[PDB]
Write an enzyme that holds these catalytic residues in place. Sequence first.
Site, PDB file in Angstrom:
ATOM      1  N   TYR A  28       0.783  -1.395   0.089  1.00  0.00           N
ATOM      2  CA  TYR A  28       0.013   0.103  -0.010  1.00  0.00           C
ATOM      3  C   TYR A  28       0.688   1.410   0.052  1.00  0.00           C
ATOM      4  CZ  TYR A  28      -4.130  -2.584   0.470  1.00  0.00           C
ATOM      5  OH  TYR A  28      -5.405  -3.456   0.186  1.00  0.00           O
ATOM      6  N   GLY A  30       2.729   3.804  -1.627  1.00  0.00           N
ATOM      7  CA  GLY A  30       3.042   4.296  -3.072  1.00  0.00           C
ATOM      8  C   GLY A  30       1.719   4.383  -3.637  1.00  0.00           C
ATOM      9  N   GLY A  32      -1.629   3.729  -5.331  1.00  0.00           N
ATOM     10  CA  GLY A  32      -2.993   2.709  -5.221  1.00  0.00           C
ATOM     11  C   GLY A  32      -2.423   1.638  -4.253  1.00  0.00           C
ATOM     12  N   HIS A  48      -4.499   5.802   5.008  1.00  0.00           N
ATOM     13  CA  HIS A  48      -4.150   6.772   4.066  1.00  0.00           C
ATOM     14  C   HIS A  48      -5.143   6.715   2.796  1.00  0.00           C
ATOM     15  CE1 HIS A  48      -1.467   9.906   1.775  1.00  0.00           C
ATOM     16  NE2 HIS A  48      -1.924  10.433   2.848  1.00  0.00           N
ATOM     17  N   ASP A  49      -4.714   5.768   2.031  1.00  0.00           N
ATOM     18  CA  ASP A  49      -5.363   5.454   0.728  1.00  0.00           C
ATOM     19  C   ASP A  49      -6.889   5.527   0.872  1.00  0.00           C
ATOM     20  OD1 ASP A  49      -2.859   4.696  -0.240  1.00  0.00           O
ATOM     21  OD2 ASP A  49      -3.302   2.706  -0.746  1.00  0.00           O
ATOM     22  N   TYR A  52      -7.750   9.209   1.127  1.00  0.00           N
ATOM     23  CA  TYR A  52      -7.822   9.885   0.105  1.00  0.00           C
ATOM     24  C   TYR A  52      -9.281   9.432  -0.770  1.00  0.00           C
ATOM     25  CZ  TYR A  52      -3.224  11.997  -0.080  1.00  0.00           C
ATOM     26  OH  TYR A  52      -2.011  12.709   0.351  1.00  0.00           O
ATOM     27  N   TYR A  73      -2.564  22.341   0.385  1.00  0.00           N
ATOM     28  CA  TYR A  73      -3.086  23.057   1.519  1.00  0.00           C
ATOM     29  C   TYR A  73      -2.033  23.686   2.384  1.00  0.00           C
ATOM     30  CZ  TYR A  73      -1.229  18.424   3.329  1.00  0.00           C
ATOM     31  OH  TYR A  73      -0.443  17.632   3.682  1.00  0.00           O
ATOM     32  N   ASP A  99      -3.345  13.307   5.620  1.00  0.00           N
ATOM     33  CA  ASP A  99      -1.852  13.306   5.640  1.00  0.00           C
ATOM     34  C   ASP A  99      -1.291  13.331   6.925  1.00  0.00           C
ATOM     35  OD1 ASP A  99      -1.950  13.355   2.752  1.00  0.00           O
ATOM     36  OD2 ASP A  99      -1.233  15.304   2.509  1.00  0.00           O
TER      37      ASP A  99
HETATM   38 CA   LIG Z   1      -1.224   3.709  -1.955  1.00  0.00          CA
END
Ligand SMILES: [Ca+2]
Length: 123
Positions: A28, A30, A32, A48-49, A52, A73, A99
């Site tokens: 995970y 990187g 996708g 985190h993915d 997003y 931001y 983040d």
């Molecule tokens: Ca990822």
Amino acid sequence: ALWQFNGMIKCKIPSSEPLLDFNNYGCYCGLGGSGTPVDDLDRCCQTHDNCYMQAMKLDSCKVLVDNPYTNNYSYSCSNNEITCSSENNACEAFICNCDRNAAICFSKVPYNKEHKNLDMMNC
Ligand SMILES: [Ca+2]
Ligand SMILES: [Cl-]
């Protein structure tokens, strides 16, 4: 955006070059992802993915091409603490929180070198 996320991770982990250390790690960390996270760091990246993905569901992000890796931001690093800003609009604020949470998560889990550049047949 990726620039701000890099600085957040350096805020929490001042020895790191995050775009090297935390890219192409596990299944995970990187762009996708897939499969089962290999360790708690990879799980930070999965969360985190997902964050997003949740961001992009918000109408406030849909209106602006506010693609989380390219959406600037505002935040600060001070005494190795991250603060997202009240001047961020809703999409920016959500991304900033994704983040910040990931940067903190990365800083509190082991880093296992065996999972760097992992073979995707593991994912
Ligand atoms: Ca990822
Ligand atoms: Cl913090």
